[PDB]
Design a binder for these strands. Structure first.
Lengths: 62, 62
DNA sequence: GAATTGTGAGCGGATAACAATTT
DNA sequence: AAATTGTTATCCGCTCACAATTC
């Protein structure tokens, strides 16, 4: 109930939603500054991956 | 687990993914000929209808 | 015109690459 | 050149629309 998208995390962090995909997967081209902000945002919004959209798009991850 | 998609069923029945979805949904534009072929094909590969994808495809609502 | 069947695009989301800027 | 950040395009099982064919 009331999930959190990777979009919410980006919006709060003040970065592009792709910046999250980066920290989540391609840590490359991701400075510690931005990385730390995204990681912290995951707790702020209480990031709960879109079980429907993620499983669909190709990111079930258990 | 093998997440069989409507494409896998359509490929087995020799139909379209739209046809498969029409059979799974049981709404309109579906003939009994293809319906019984899709229900049979989805039984071979053990197709699991994704309700999450359905919610998304039909515009994720609250 | 509607139904049937197939193809294309979108839903809302994510992933990857490219261009520009900084170091 | 490499790293960093933002942006565009494509992909995902499913649904809708469009196109073609048949009724």
């Amino acid at each position: 109930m009331k999930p959190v998208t990777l979009y919410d995390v980006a919006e709060y962090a003040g970065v592009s939603y792709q910046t999250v995909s980066r920290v989540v997967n391609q840590a490359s081209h991701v400075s510690a500054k931005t990385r730390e902000k995204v990681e912290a945002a995951m707790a702020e919004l209480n990031y709960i991956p879109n079980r429907c959209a993620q499983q669909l798009a190709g990111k079930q991850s258990l």
